[PDB]
Design a protein around this ligand. Structure first.
Ligand SMILES: CCCCCCCC/C=C\CCCCCCCC(=O)O[C@H](COC(=O)CCCCCCCCCCCCCCC)COP(=O)(O)OC[C@@H](O)CO
Ligand SMILES: O=S(=O)(c1ccccc1)N1CCCC12CCN(c1nc3ccccc3o1)CC2
Ligand SMILES: CCCCCCCCS[C@@H]1O[C@H](CO)[C@@H](O)[C@H](O)[C@H]1O
Ligand SMILES: CCCCCCCCS[C@@H]1O[C@H](CO)[C@@H](O)[C@H](O)[C@H]1O
Ligand SMILES: CCCCCCCCS[C@@H]1O[C@H](CO)[C@@H](O)[C@H](O)[C@H]1O
Ligand SMILES: CCCCCCCCS[C@@H]1O[C@H](CO)[C@@H](O)[C@H](O)[C@H]1O
Ligand SMILES: CCCCCCCCS[C@@H]1O[C@H](CO)[C@@H](O)[C@H](O)[C@H]1O
Ligand SMILES: CCCCCCCCS[C@@H]1O[C@H](CO)[C@@H](O)[C@H](O)[C@H]1O
Ligand code: NA
Length: 297
């Protein structure tokens, strides 16, 4: 008789959760394999092709290294947490994995910043600072040094406490998380991305002669990369400011809605690592050639 009520309960209790888990696991697995393969191909492309060993491509290889760190270590953990909302990797990985995720984000945004800086001095203010690949290696090492150092507090606050275990930041007072997460948002997101936007805007005014055509191609590619980065990282950055600085989502009226929003934001962060190699494949003929050689083999 009441078949419609039975169908509604079947959708809520079985059909919807099953489809939700399927889409979640499929999106994560697809991003995982695509990111691993494409970033490994970025590194292989610049290692086999000596003519692609430019300062920009060296920084892009570093960006692929940071994306591979995130994708290989943190992505499976983020997937399992978005599934169970609990921590199953133990007290030590509770510090290590979030630490490596934050270090990956810092290396990513600092690498994009240094690419924007190299392009801005090369195009807008030439002949002030020499930019060489060998100095790019030192800039990359310093990027990793700074990133590993400044994310130590992130590791220090992580704790894995019994409830099943939960891994989360532990704060002795209400003010410290607000100050720290304000600084985290401004340093890893807003400030570098706003400065990169102003730099690339000046580069666009300057560029728009074989060198100018090659520079237009590479600058269009780098602008796309920065834009997709800002888009992929906006949701999680805003949600963490709202949670940690404004105290939102403490209520559990629709706890599943908060879980879905945070889950999609985590997945967007991991999707950026899969996106970047595809961007090089469509906006760089040289990367596209090396990727074609990889797929043919
Ligand atoms: C995290 C720390 C580590 C970062 C790592 C380093 C990152 C390195 C990246 C890039 C460096 C290159 C920067 C490029 C130089 C900056 C580019 C620039 O000068 O833009 C100016 C315009 O600004 C303006 O209106 C005034 C600026 C208004 C800014 C409002 C938004 C602020 C937030 C945004 C971030 C602020 C951060 C500040 C940190 C000190 C000049 O305009 P222009 O004459 O051409 O035409 C005028 C026309 O726009 C009038 O409408
Ligand atoms: O919202 S974040 O996720 C974030 C991430 C990226 C950009 C912006 C914000 N976030 C806010 C600041 C400190 C941090 C805490 C949690 N960390 C983490 N826990 C993790 C648990 C499992 C796997 C990876 C993990 O990474 C990563 C860094
Ligand atoms: C991999 C993660 C999959 C979980 C997706 C969450 C979907 C929750 S629907 C959930 O179904 C329950 C009965 O099963 C009801 O009691 C709840 O009221 C209703 O909200
Ligand atoms: C005009 C040249 S400026 C010059 O540029 C060099 C680049 O390396 C630096 O080594 C020097 O210190 C600096 O004076
Ligand atoms: C917030 C981050 C601001 C960073 C400003 C400094 C940029 C690093 S320059 C780079 O430093 C390396 C250190 O190892 C040297 O080896 C290289 O020769 C040199 O090119
Ligand atoms: C870019 C990828 C970032 C991944 C972020 C993982 C979020 C973990 S936060 C913390 O995780 C606990 C499980 O340990 C949950 O029970 C809590 O509800 C939640 O607050
Ligand atoms: C701005 S944060 C705000 O400042 C208060 C002081 O008035 C503190 O109690 C808390 O940190 C918070 O409510
Ligand atoms: C660099 C340091 C920056 C600290 C920023 C603190 C911002 C104020 S939080 C404030 O707390 C209220 C308590 O009632 C909440 O109701 C509001 O949602 C929220 O606006
Ligand atoms: Na990324």
């Amino acid at each position: 008789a009441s078949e419609d009520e039975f169908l509604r309960y079947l959708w809520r209790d079985y059909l919807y959760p099953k489809q939700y888990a399927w889409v979640l696991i499929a999106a994560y697995v697809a991003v995982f394999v695509v990111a691993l393969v494409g970033n490994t191909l970025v590194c292989l492309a610049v290692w086999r092709n000596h003519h692609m060993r430019t300062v920009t491509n060296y920084f892009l290889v570093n960006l692929s290294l940071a994306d591979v760190l995130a994708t290989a270590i943190c992505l499976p953990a983020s997937l399992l947490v978005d599934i169970t909302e609990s921590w199953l990797f133990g007290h030590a990985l509770c510090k290590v994995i979030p630490y490596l995720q934050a270090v990956s984000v810092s290396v990513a945004v600092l690498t994009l910043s240094f690419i924007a800086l190299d392009r801005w001095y090369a195009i807008c203010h030439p002949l002030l600072f020499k930019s060489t690949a060998r100095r790019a290696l030192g800039s990359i090492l310093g990027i990793w040094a700074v990133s590993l150092a400044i994310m130590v507090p992130q590791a220090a606050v992580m704790e894995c406490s019994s409830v099943f275990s939960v891994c989360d930041e532990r704060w002795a007072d209400d003010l410290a998380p607000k100050i720290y997460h304000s600084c985290f948002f401004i340093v890893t997101y807003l400030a570098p991305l706003g400065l990169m936007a102003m730099a690339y805007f000046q580069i666009f005014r300057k560029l728009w002669v074989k060198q100018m055509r090659a520079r237009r191609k590479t600058a269009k590619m780098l602008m796309v990369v920065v834009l997709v980065f800002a888009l992929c990282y906006l949701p999680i950055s805003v949600l963490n400011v709202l949670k940690r600085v404004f105290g939102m989502f403490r209520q559990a009226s629709d706890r599943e809605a908060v879980y879905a929003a945070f889950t999609f934001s985590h997945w967007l962060v991991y999707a950026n690592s899969a996106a970047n190699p595809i961007i090089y494949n469509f906006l760089s003929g040289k990367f596209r050639e090396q990727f074609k050689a990889a797929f043919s083999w």
